[PDB]
């Protein structure tokens, strides 16, 4: 008849109806009542006279702050009583003493700060008690003394600081005890005395500085947890008095040294996880324990694994031994249940074929960051299914393929010196692979293609034609300049020097074309051979030297023109010194990429500025900046002739050559700064072709612009023809 609901099986629910007092008019024969989420501030004297047959009473969240001592009188049959989330500042000592048949009492989520001495007296049948999320400052020893029949006590989220001796002496029937999230610092010697039936003990999130010696008085423990504490040592035989332990939570602590035989004779332990125990040297002497499924030891100084590991631990499934100093590996035969093996960041230096022999149910293997130097061919043959296998960052000259046809994810990152490549005919199921060297995955782009160096027929033809023309023109010009006379004018010397310098670029282009021809349809295999071999570095150095020599020759010509237009100095010795020092500057520029490592090997083209930002940002940017800035001095020098557009005799060809060289250099030089300016993006193949074409053009052009635009060329040819006649 009440505004709240009802139930057929003598149950009444009135949660969340906003009641201020207990509901009236209900049936006298009521077995359960719920008044949880109403706003009731007090229970009067005669509150529950109309419900003599109550068995369950709920008042959670009522904002209840007063209980009359006679309010619960007459509820002799009451069995369950909940009062959580109310504002009871203290345990209701007087109110609840009349509940002879009470079995469950919830008082958590309150602001309890004091417990009267005579509290809980007369509660003979009590079996469960909640006191969580309160402001308790010490264990209520005497109030608990009146509850010999208690079966589950929890005192979490309080401010307990220390537990005195014989605190729970009379609670011989207790089987569950929670004490986590307290500020407990010290446990007395006999605090847990008399808890012979306890099965779970929770001590997480406390501030224990030393391992609790009291747990030696618990003979029936099955679950123990003391993580998030400040414990640093488990001295020896700490769990000697707990043969039945199954689960231990100790994985968040400043652990530094666990005893050699700390975990010993624990025949029912399931999981053993130890992290950061640096001082540990030997393997844990875990004899007797033969029921392990996970064994994880990390951050220690373990130097060896015992041969008897899983011939004893036949149930072992996960074995994590990362970090540490494991140098040798004992044969893992008998490890029939091993699913995951982790050995990353160790001193393992080889895997003989007898190491991983005999494993069937293996699923994941980890060997990253080790020093594995060699693996025998059949070392991987014997294992069954494999899904992961990491050998990243080791010294593997060769890697066998037999027995990895079922492999799914493979990781060899950083395995430099692993030159000889894999093949898809054995590795069939992989769709996850990362390899050292470069373009090892061309069998399974646009920068180091496995097909050919160039690929585009037009690009290769243009490169071959440019190389041949540049070679012929440079040879003819050099021969003519050298045979012209015993003495060469400054302009003639500069022209001869430029023609000689173009020879470096011509030879580099010829070498690149020959490599592409050899790599036609097979470049991949050659690729690494080029990168590892001195050929690519030599080609890159030659290209850099040719560019530097061309820049130096242009600068020398500009300086001579400026001196002529400003003065005459006639410093032939100075000109020879500058010509000689141009070679020294080019050598210094080339050695700049040689002192650093990994510069020329970045790409098969050997270009100083490959795709992406150059790791040697300093020198790479400085060289381009100097090359660009030289144009400012060149323009400042040439402005005198530009304003009148000496150029009277032959400067016309020189100016055009300088302008063409500057224009060709500008795109390649700007491409080196593309990574800094994200607004500009270039495709890999297109960028490669553009760089290749820009590089040869100055050498392809300059001899033609000199001979084809200088009548002095024909004059010298005719004069030197006398040597032929």
């Amino acid at each position, epitope marked *: 008849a009440a505004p709240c609901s009802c139930d057929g099986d003598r149950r009444v629910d009135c949660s969340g109806k906003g009641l201020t007092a207990v509901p009236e008019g209900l049936s006298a024969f009521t077995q359960a009542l719920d008044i949880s989420m109403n706003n009731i501030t007090q229970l009067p004297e005669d509150a529950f006279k109309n419900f003599p047959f109550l068995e369950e009473l709920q008042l959670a969240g009522n904002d209840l702050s007063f209980i009359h001592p006679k309010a619960l009188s007459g509820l002799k049959e009451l069995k369950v009583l909940t009062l959580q989330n109310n*504002q009871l500042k*203290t345990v209701p000592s007087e109110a609840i003493r009349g509940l002879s048949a009470l079995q469950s009492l919830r008082l958590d989520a309150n602001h309890i700060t004091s417990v009267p001495e005579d509290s809980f007296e007369g509660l003979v049948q009590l079996r469960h008690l909640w006191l969580d999320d309160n402001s308790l400052t010490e264990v209520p020893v005497h109030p608990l003394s009146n509850l010999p029949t208690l079966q589950a006590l929890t005192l979490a989220l309080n401010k307990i600081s220390s537990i005195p001796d014989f605190a729970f002496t009379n609670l011989s029937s207790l089987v569950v005890l929670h004490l986590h999230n307290n500020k407990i610092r010290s446990l007395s010697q006999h605090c847990f005395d008399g808890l012979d039936n306890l099965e779970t003990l929770d001590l997480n999130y406390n501030n224990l500085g030393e391992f609790p010696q009291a747990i030696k008085a618990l003979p029936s423990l099955k679950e123990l947890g003391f993580h998030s504490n400040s414990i640093s040592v488990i001295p020896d035989g700490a769990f000697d008095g707990n043969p039945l332990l199954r689960t231990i939570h100790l994985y968040d602590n400043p652990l530094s040294f666990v005893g050699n035989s700390a975990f010993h004779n624990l025949s029912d332990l399931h999981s053993l996880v130890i992290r950061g125990a640096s001082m540990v040297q030997q393997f844990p002497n875990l004899t007797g324990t033969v029921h392990l499924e996970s064994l994880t030891l990390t951050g220690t100084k373990i130097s060896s694994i015992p041969n008897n590991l899983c011939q004893e631990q036949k149930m072992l499934r996960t074995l994590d031994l990362s970090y540490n100093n494991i140098r040798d590996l004992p044969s893992f035969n008998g490890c029939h249940a091993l699913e995951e093996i982790s050995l990353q960041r160790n001193q393992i230096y080889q895997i003989k074929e007898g190491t991983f022999q005999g494993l069937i149910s293996l699923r994941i293997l980890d060997l990253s960051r080790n020093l594995i130097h060699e693996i025998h061919s059949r070392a991987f043959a014997t294992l069954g299914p494999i899904t992961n296998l990491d050998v990243s960052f080791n010294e593997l000259t060769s890697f066998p393929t037999e027995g990895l046809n079922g492999l799914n994810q493979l990781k060899l990152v950083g395995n430099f010196k692993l030159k000889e490549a894999l093949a898809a005919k054995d590795f069939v199921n992989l769709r996850s692979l990362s390899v050292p060297y470069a373009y090892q995955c061309c069998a399974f782009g646009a920068f180091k293609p496995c097909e050919y160096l160039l690929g585009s027929w037009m690009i290769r033809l243009t490169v071959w034609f440019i190389f041949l023309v540049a070679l012929f023109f440079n040879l003819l010009v050099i021969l003519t300049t050298f045979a012209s006379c015993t003495s060469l004018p400054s302009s003639k010397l500069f022209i001869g020097l430029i023609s000689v310098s173009n020879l470096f670029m011509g030879i580099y282009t010829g070498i690149l074309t020959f490599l592409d021809a050899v790599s036609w349809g097979r470049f991949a295999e050659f690729g690494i051979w080029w990168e590892t071999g001195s050929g690519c570095k030599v080609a890159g150095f030659l290209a850099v030297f040719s560019s530097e020599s061309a820049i130096f020759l242009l600068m020398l010509a500009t300086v001579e023109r400026s001196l002529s237009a400003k003065d005459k100095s006639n410093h032939l010795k100075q000109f020879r010194v500058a010509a000689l020092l141009a070679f020294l500057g080019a050598t210094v520029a080339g050695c700049f990429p040689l002192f650093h490592r990994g510069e020329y090997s970045a790409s098969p083209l050997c270009l100083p500025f490959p795709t992406g930002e150059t790791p040697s940002l300093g020198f790479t940017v400085t060289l381009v900046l100097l090359n660009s800035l030289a144009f400012l001095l060149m323009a400042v020098i040439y402005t005198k002739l530009y304003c009148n557009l000496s150029q009277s005799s032959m400067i016309k060809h020189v100016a055009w050559l300088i302008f063409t060289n500057c224009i060709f250099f500008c795109p390649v030089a700007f491409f080196s700064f593309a990574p800094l300016i994200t607004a500009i993006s270039i495709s890999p193949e297109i960028m490669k072709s553009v760089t290749l074409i820009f590089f040869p053009l100055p050498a392809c052009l300059n001899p033609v612009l000199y001979v084809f635009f200088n009548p002095k060329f024909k004059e010298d040819w005719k004069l030197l023809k006398r040597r032929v006649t």
Partner: nanobody
Amino acid sequence: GSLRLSCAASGYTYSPYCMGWFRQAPGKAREGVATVDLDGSTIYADSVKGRFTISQDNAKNTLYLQMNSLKPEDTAMYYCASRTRAGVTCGLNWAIFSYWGQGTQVTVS
């Protein structure tokens, strides 16, 4: 105001173990005012330390609480409470008392 807040115990006469005065603001919890045990030891609340004074006439069970210079915060309903057995320490805890009175009103304006 010379406000005498008297009490009277009508059940039994022989000195109960502890007798206190408490107060309640409308709708809030019961917090103590004063307590006195069989030996005559006396306890007061911090807000009550000086203004009030708890007394007793044991032979007659008339137990007064004297209030003077009442603060405006002192508007509440006051309860006289008692306890018989000795199995607790005396203090301003509402959960230890066994018998509670109907209380009265004191409106300080």
